[PDB]
Amino acid sequence: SSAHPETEPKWWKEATFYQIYPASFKDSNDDGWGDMKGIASKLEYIKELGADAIWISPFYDSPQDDMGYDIANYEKVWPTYGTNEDCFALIEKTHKLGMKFITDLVINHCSSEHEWFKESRSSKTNPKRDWFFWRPPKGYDAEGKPIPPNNWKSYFGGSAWTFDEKTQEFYLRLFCSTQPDLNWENEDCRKAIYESAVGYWLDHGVDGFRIDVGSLYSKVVGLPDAPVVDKNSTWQSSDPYTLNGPRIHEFHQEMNQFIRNRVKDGREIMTVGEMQHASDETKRLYTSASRHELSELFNFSHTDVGTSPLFRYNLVPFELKDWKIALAELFRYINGTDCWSTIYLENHDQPRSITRFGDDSPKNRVISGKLLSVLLSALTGTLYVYQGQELGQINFKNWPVEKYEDVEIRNNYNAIKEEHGENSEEMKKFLEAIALISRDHARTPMQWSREEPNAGFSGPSAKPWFYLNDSFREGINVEDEIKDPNSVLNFWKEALKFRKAHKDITVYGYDFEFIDLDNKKLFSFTKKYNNKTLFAALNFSSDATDFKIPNDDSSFKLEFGNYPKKEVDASSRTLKPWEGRIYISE
Ligand SMILES: [Ca+2]
């Protein structure tokens, strides 16, 4: 393990993180919105699950146009969630339970309601004008409407520019119209961002940051028109000119140094960057400890399978190998380096993993939920569990488009309507996709009980901010699952215990090798840690499936699996439907 610098222990490498979506976790005052007191009341639940740390999605003052990712004040909690003192009390309570606390750092853009933008937009001459990207119209079209500066597409559909009537210029917003991108080319802007979004929270005791689209801060000079790669779209991906831009490492090094110099008590701060896409070299430039940029990053390849590279909301076929390779992209690059990795299948931007990668049928949702737990339990990196994942939550079913809350759905819907028509093949394909892929499958309220109609998320008289998934009535809720010894929740508790007990090879394991990579059912691999070898055989199918252990001998002992412990023949070399097994040899 000496020629593997990645094995050097750190709190944040072996911590299991639980991600909380504050709007949807726990309402304590029956207004239908989750809040900080609600979260505080459930910290013991999170600890009992086996989490070592929490990441809370944005809880700062925000109009909620992107449900918190449009921040109007980095230094003030959104009043509906509580006060700043509520937040400080929550951080302290988390700490006193022996858990770490990370906050969401969203500094590619802020809300147009942020005072910085209110000043910026007020005139062309004010000191904050170039804290954002302002450009005149390219011209005017045949109807007299201003034409945006370039052809860039918003992440949520349509143009990535919004026209300001007062100053007669467009401003850049890669996200929704009220999320103006901050101009990192302006050094005063960078310094103000660090003070407000970073320093304030360091001063108030956070253990780290999850960094929202951290790979977008560097725009290529001139903001040039992007390549026309999508021949059926007016607007084009800006990735060549906005993703991992030429100053992106400079900016991350600078912010890393700011953090190092601002911490007052010598504590170790973790940063996890939501970087989206990166070559392995780019990942290394970001996460190598010697680079002093990020601790680790999220890479989306595994959550992109089954979606078109041109448009997330067009489905395409995939096979198991595609997902195997995409998952391995998270961690193989760290082998024999001072880099570090993340491991996750769910977050507030993703549909449910059982639906996507297991089988959410009444017959298979429990066993396949456990299979996914077995897989994640064995992988190298910082493990993240998203609220409800531990319950085996599944996608919602048969929702009309008008029920979806997400701006990503609303904006894409409207762009398709405008470009192709409401009654079009393009719309049909979109509607097909949202049923599988929408971020909203992550965002329905957390299911605490079977109580009608709000599942213990709020009192029965409240109107939740977003609709409940009907699954709470099918026993997918905390109260019912605690009592069912066979539940997905109780299994996740086991899986985290197993992972911790074997952390050298589960968390810190190296030399990952696939076994039978092409197999459309069997997901199998080995890992090493000194004299130890871990072997996984995971059957992602409703069929029985054979496997082989390479260099098999008597030393391989069955240590974890999802079929009943007393009813498994460890010597058998055929897996039952949805069966997973982890063997370890010493
Ligand atoms: Ca509330």
Task: Tell me, letter by letter, the H, E, C secondary structure of 218-262.
Answer: CCCCCCCCCCCCCCCCCCECCHHHHCCCCCHHHHHHHHHHHHHHH
CA 475 to CA 481: how far, in whole Å?
7
Pair of tokens at residue 279: 């070559």
Question: What is the spatial order of strands in the sheet that 532-539 belongs to?
Answer: 510-515, 522-529, 532-539, 580-585, 557-561
CATH class of 510-586: mainly beta
Tokens, residue 334: 């760290």
241 with 160: CB under 8 angstroms? no
- Asked if residue 179 lies in contact with residue 111, where contact means CB atoms within 8 angstroms, the answer is yes
CB proximity list for 378: less than 8 A, separation 6 or greater = 499, 506, 509, 527, 534, 536, 560, 582
Q: Shortest CA distance to 274 belongs to which of 305, 292, 242, 296?
A: 296
Among residues 498, 536, 496, 530, which one has the least CA distance to residue 511?
Answer: 530
What is the separation, in whole angstroms, between the first and last Cα of the chain?
15
- For residue 107, which of 194, 32, 3 has the smallest C-alpha distance? 194
Residues 6+ apart with CB under 8 A from 354: 360, 365, 368, 369, 372, 392, 393, 394
| Interstrand relation of 53-56 and 574-575 (parallel, antiparallel or unpaired) | unpaired
Of 63, 26, 17, nearest in space to 454 by CA? 26
- Size of the chain, expressed as the number of residues it contains: 586
Whether 53 and 91 have beta carbons less than 8 Å apart is answered as: no
Question: 3-state class of 585 per DSSP?
Answer: strand
322, amino acid identity: D
d(CA 242, CA 361): 40
Interval between CA 479 and ligand 1 midpoint (Å): 21
Question: Which of 471, 450, 454 shows the shortest CA–CA distance to 463?
Answer: 454
Q: Which residue carries 């606390």 as its tokens?
A: 101
> Which letter does DSSP use for residue 476 in this model?
-
Which pair of tokens denotes residue 80?
Answer: 């509906």
Query: For residue 514, how far is its CA from the centre of ligand 1 (angstroms)?
Result: 47
Q: How far is the CA of 457 from the centre of ligand 1 (A)?
A: 10
Question: Architecture of 111-186 per CATH?
Answer: Alpha-Beta Complex (3.90)
Cis peptide before 453 (omega within 30 of 0): yes
Ramachandran class of 455: left when φ > 0, alpha when ψ lies in -120 to 50, beta otherwise: left
Q: Which residues pair with 101 in a beta bridge?
A: 54
Cite the residue boundaries of each domain of the chain with CATH code 2.60.40.1180. 510-586
- The residue to which tokens 């009592």 are assigned: 483
Half-sphere exposure of residue 110, counting CA atoms within 13 Å on the CB side?
27
In the chain, DSSP finds a helix count (H) and a strand count (E) of 19, 24
Whole-angstrom distance, CA of residue 324 vs CA of residue 357: 11
- The owner of tokens 């560097």 is 218
Q: Which residues of 329-342 are buried (b: 16+ CB within 10 A; e: fewer)?
A: bbbbbbbebebbbb
DSSP 194: I
> Which neighbouring-strand residues pair with 585?
533
Give the separation between CA 478 and CA 472, rounded to whole angstroms: 9
Resolution in A: 1.6
Residues 6+ apart with CB under 8 A from 541: 520, 521, 577, 578
What is the set of active-site residues?
212, 274
Query: Two tokens at 141?
Result: 């079209």
Cα 30 to averaged position of ligand 1 atoms, centre (Å):
6
Coil vs helix vs strand at 562: coil
| Spatial distance between the Cα atoms of 549 and 568, rounded to a whole number of angstroms | 17
- Could you count the other beta carbons within 10 Å of the beta carbon of residue 188? 12
Tell me, in angstroms, the distance from the centre of ligand 1 to residue 470's CA.
Answer: 21
Close Cβ partners of 248 (under 8 Å, ≥ 6 residues apart): 215, 217, 218
CA–CA separation, 572 and 541 (whole Å): 18
Count of other CB atoms within 10 angstroms of residue 381: 21
Which tokens in the block code for residue 235? 């607007």
* In the chain, ranges of CATH 3.90.400.10 domains: 111-186
Measure 354 CA to ligand 1 centroid, in angstroms.
29
Distance CA 77, CA 562 (A): 42
DSSP string of 397-466, one letter each residue: -S--GGG---HHHHHHHHHHHHHH-SSSHHHHHHHHHHHHH-GGGGTSPP-----TTTTTSS-TT---SS
Tell me the three-class secondary structure of 41-96, residue by residue. Answer: HCHHHHHHHCCCEEEECCCEECCCCCCCCCCCEEEEECCCCCCHHHHHHHHHHHHH
Q: What is the dihedral of CA 392, 393, 394, 398, to 10 degrees?
A: 150
At 309, is the secondary structure helix, strand, or coil?
Answer: coil
Rounded to whole angstroms, how far apart are CA atoms 396 and 280? 35
3-state secondary structure of 149: coil
For residues 344 and 441, give the distance between their C-alpha atoms in angstroms, rounded to a whole number: 16
Distance in Å, CA 252 to ligand 1 centroid:
36
24 with 42: CB under 8 angstroms?
Answer: no
For 384, what's the count of Cα atoms within 13 Å in the CB-facing half-sphere?
A: 23
Looking at the domain 1-110+187-509, which fold is it?
TIM Barrel (3.20.20)
Cβ contact 58:66 at 8 Å? no
Joined together, the tokens standing for residue 297 give: 């990053």
Is the C-alpha dihedral spanning 496, 500, 503, 507 positive or negative? positive
Name the segment(s) of the chain with CATH classification 3.20.20.80: 1-110+187-509
CA pair distance 236, 228, nearest whole angstrom: 6
Would you tell me how many other CB atoms lie within 10 Å of the CB of residue 317? 7
C-alpha 64 – ligand 1 centre gap (Å): 15
Beta strands 545-546 and 574-575: pairing type? antiparallel
| Spatial separation of the C-alpha atoms in residues 331 and 341, rounded to whole Å | 5
Q: Which of 98, 87, 96 is nearest to 16 (CA)?
A: 98
